[PDB]
Design a binder for this molecule. Structure first.
Ligand SMILES: CN(C)C1CCN(C(=O)c2ccc(NC(=O)Nc3ccc(-c4nc(N5CCOCC5)nc(N5CCOCC5)n4)cc3)cc2)CC1
Length: 815
């Protein structure tokens, strides 16, 4: 029936068929599809049709200090389409309109799907704050409110634990293998057993009972039997010992395992390898007063250490014995719940009784760095994780958008498909279309290139698509059609000039040919900027990048006729690199901008849009009027390491007509340069090549390519300095802003550390040992007073000065 065709539509939008039961050994996934029906219908029935249709992008945070200095005498100007109007920062849009009349029309941004509606002061609209930040004019058309009808929804024992290892079987690959069974709880290995080593052949039968030290009723929920094969670790797979019904897992299992590549979130999945033809299989059978002062000081010191400082045994004993004292310190919760013997039923009982009375945690102000910690790989207990989700519930949509990528990623750490976190994401995406757009694209990113989690993520994405309404479904469908067309063009063009050729006649020929052939997809929403709709292509402006991986430089017209400007929307389509790394780094940069805003700073970061759409394939926003610092060098002294340091300021002058425009660009440059210095330093991506640093004609600096990130702490070359002048008066400004921004980030050390380690676990595999994570703790001068930290950053600046083009000259000889 047509219901089946609708499920087909959903499948095509998802990129995976959630009704497939070809790679399941239980009904957990379908159980979750069924359990999600209620949160979906409940948020749908709960949301306001009008605000959900117009999706006003609002914030309750106060107006920053740097935006106030840009205001007139309590007088924001709104150009309505077409007269200008004075308005008070605290003037509601409704009051604005009733003032403009002296009845039901709504103000929509010109050239955008963005609306200034709701009982919010224009002070508090992100588009208005963005216009103020960039000194643009709030241009609005008096449109008629979109029909909410277009959002309508298609209505829907004391025995010890034993595991029998029968054997392993592969048709692939003189070695020797043994099997290893672990009872794991949140990366805590409760107990461990091994089989004897038998020669590695395509079939190894043990028929061996591995008896564990843990008793059946001490198994905690969320505990995993982790089965691994060693020759080095060759393969792994995981089975939940308590399923989604709290039933002890019994029966026969034949689990197709994951292969290792010669620690990260894939090693945790409960999913089995779908590739049953080539993948290693394993076969198994289951059948079953108050403290003294010195101790107070020690406990406080422990609670004070950072999220990476590991807890010794005595530390955990102290935290557990004084658990009720520790419960008053919400900052101690991550460490307290790591001091819990989860393999002991009585201790987990005491732990739940502890969580029972948590008035201090409930009342505390939301601390995201703490919530995230509780949501990471070190916490399986769903009750421990549910309090983090509880705190998350109080985030406004603006903050949800700030943290949505890494919350979605954090879903990879949930033991079960249906989690508090999953339902929270579902709710927030259904309540608000901007969150829903990005939830769609993030879930789909992972569903398109992760067998390890595509099933769970596909269940969540289907749950979302069944409540977002048919309008947004049509939008997603158009977008997916367009992106698939364009990825087809990208790959087919990549095939045509594989290596060692810059650009051919035939190449540009075929590219323009296909783009002309493809345009006969009328209009689609820009995935990295859902307020922008792209129209026809500007075939004449589209080109093959002429990079190693020949990415596509495409440009579209804006489909919105109310659009004021005539600028095209530029998108780069790239295949060959894993752009999820870029998504993560850019999202951390956005969090850094947010942190800086809390302290009335603006470092003019340009976190360009970037959506990973598949396996080593994605799109990148084209910042208009931007060029590489390397290219500005080459243009005046081409193919030479001389790197004449006077050239950047000459270029700035050239592109800025008015000396005043030049000074504005120089100040923009001071700020954006300080911001990128601090950010790349903290993240350990500051030692980049001249070619991966771009600048807008208006002086805004910004880095690109966060996959190719490999000595110097960051890039502060003699040419940036010449744009500053070297001591000088603007270089003093640079150092001042840098110390301020660095200290501002050190004020959120914990959040930055948890986000960084999460990125390491969920982005690219690389090394991702403890060692990679520790660098950031170092760069944030953990356990240091702010004075020494400012000294540390100024020492980094001085190393930059001393090295000169040595760094850049070697980057040039190397590339
Ligand atoms: C160790 N090793 C052997 C490997 C191992 C594995 N591995 C990866 O698998 C991998 C994963 C992710 C990335 N990530 C990535 O590549 N990200 C990106 C790259 C370029 C751009 C760009 N590039 C240009 N061009 C360059 C030159 O001048 C200008 C043109 N322009 C723009 N702009 C957009 C904004 O507006 C202005 C134009 N963006 C934007 C993003 C790379 C590689 C790591 C390396």
């Amino acid at each position: 029936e047509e219901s089946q065709a609708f499920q087909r539509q959903l499948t095509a939008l998802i990129g995976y068929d959630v009704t497939d039961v070809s790679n399941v050994h239980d009904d957990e996934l379908e159980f979750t599809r069924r359990g999600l029906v209620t949160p979906r219908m409940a948020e749908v029935a709960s949301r306001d049709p009008k605000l959900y249709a117009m999706h006003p992008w609002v914030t309750s945070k106060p107006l920053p200090e740097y935006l106030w200095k840009k205001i007139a005498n309590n007088c924001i100007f709104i150009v309505i389409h077409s007269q200008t109007i004075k308005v008070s920062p605290d003037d509601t849009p409704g009051a604005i309109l009733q003032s403009f009349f002296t009845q039901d029309f709504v103000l929509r941004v010109c050239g955008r799907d963005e609306y200034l509606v709701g009982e919010t002061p224009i002070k508090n609209f992100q588009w208005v704050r963005h216009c103020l930040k960039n000194g643009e004019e709030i241009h609005v058309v008096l449109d008629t409110p979109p029909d909410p009808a277009l959002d309508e929804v298609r209505k829907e024992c004391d025995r010890k634990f034993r595991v029998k290892i029968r054997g392993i079987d592969i048709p692939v690959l003189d070695l020797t293998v043994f099997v290893e069974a672990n009872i794991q709880h949140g990366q805590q290995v409760l107990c461990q057993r091994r089989t004897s080593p038998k020669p590695f052949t395509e079939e190894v039968l043990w028929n061996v009972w591995l008896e564990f030290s843990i008793k059946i009723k001490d198994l905690p929920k969320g505990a995993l039997l982790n089965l691994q094969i060693y020759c080095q670790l060759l393969y792994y797979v995981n089975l939940l010992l308590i399923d989604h019904r709290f039933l002890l897992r019994r029966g026969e299992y034949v689990l197709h395992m994951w292969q290792i590549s010669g620690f990260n979130a894939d090693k945790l999945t409960s999913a089995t390898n779908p590739d049953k033809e080539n993948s290693m299989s394993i076969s198994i059978l289951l059948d079953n007063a108050e403290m003294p002062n010195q101790l107070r000081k020690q406990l406080e010191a422990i609670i004070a250490t950072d999220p990476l400082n590991p807890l010794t045994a005595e530390d955990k004993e102290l935290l557990w014995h004084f658990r009720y004292e520790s419960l008053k310190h919400p900052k101690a919760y991550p460490k307290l719940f790591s001091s819990v013997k989860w393999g002991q039923q009585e201790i987990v009982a005491k732990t739940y009784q502890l969580l029972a009375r948590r008035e201090v945690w409930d009342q505390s102000a939301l601390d995201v760095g703490l919530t995230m910690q509780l949501l990471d790989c070190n916490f399986s207990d769903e009750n421990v994780r549910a309090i983090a989700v509880q705190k998350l519930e109080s985030l406004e949509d603006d903050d949800v958008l700030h943290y949505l990528l890494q919350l979605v990623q954090a879903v990879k750490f949930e033991p079960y498909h249906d989690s508090a976190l999953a339902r929270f994401l579902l709710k927030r995406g259904l309540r608000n279309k901007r969150i829903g757009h990005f939830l769609f694209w993030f879930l789909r990113s992972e569903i398109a290139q992760s067998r390890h989690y595509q099933q769970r993520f596909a269940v969540i994405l289907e749950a979302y698509l069944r409540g977002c309404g048919t309008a947004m479904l049509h939008d997603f469908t158009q977008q997916v059609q367009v992106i698939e067309m364009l990825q087809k063009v990208t790959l087919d063009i990549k095939s045509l000039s594989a290596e060692k050729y810059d650009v051919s006649s035939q190449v540009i020929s075929q590219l323009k040919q296909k783009l002309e052939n493809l345009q006969n997809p009328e209009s689609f929403r820009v995935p990295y900027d859902p307020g922008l709709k792209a129209g026809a292509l500007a075939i004449e402006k589209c080109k093959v990048m002429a990079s190693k991986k020949k990415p596509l430089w495409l440009e579209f017209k804006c489909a919105d006729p109310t659009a004021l400007s005539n600028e095209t929307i530029g998108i780069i389509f790239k295949h060959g690199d894993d752009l999820r790394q870029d998504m993560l780094i850019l999202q951390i940069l956005r969090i850094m901008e947010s942190i800086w805003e809390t302290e009335s700073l603006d470092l003019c970061l340009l976190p360009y849009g970037c959506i990973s759409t598949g396996d080593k394939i994605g799109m990148i926003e084209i910042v208009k009027d931007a060029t590489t610092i390397a290219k500005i060098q080459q243009s005046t002294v081409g193919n030479t390491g001389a790197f004449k340091d006077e050239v950047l300021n000459h270029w700035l002058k050239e592109k800025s007509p008015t000396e005043e425009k030049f000074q504005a660009a120089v100040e923009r440059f001071v700020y954006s340069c300080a911001g990128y210095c601090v950010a790349t330093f903290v993240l350990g991506i500051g030692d980049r090549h001249n070619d991966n640093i771009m600048i807008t004609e208006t002086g805004n600096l910004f880095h690109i390519d966060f996959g190719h990130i490999l000595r110097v702490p960051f890039v502060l070359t003699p040419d940036f300095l010449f744009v500053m002048g070297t001591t000088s008066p603007h270089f003093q400004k640079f150092q001042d802003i840098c110390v301020k921004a660095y200290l501002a980030l050190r004020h959120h050390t914990n959040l930055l550390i948890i986000l960084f380690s999460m990125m390491l676990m969920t982005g690219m595999p690389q090394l991702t040992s403890k060692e990679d994570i520790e660098y950031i703790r170092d760069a944030l001068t953990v356990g240091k007073n702010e004075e020494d930290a400012k000294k540390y950053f100024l020492d980094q600046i001085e190393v930059c000065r001393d090295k000169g083009w040595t760094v850049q000259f070697n980057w040039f000889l190397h590339l």
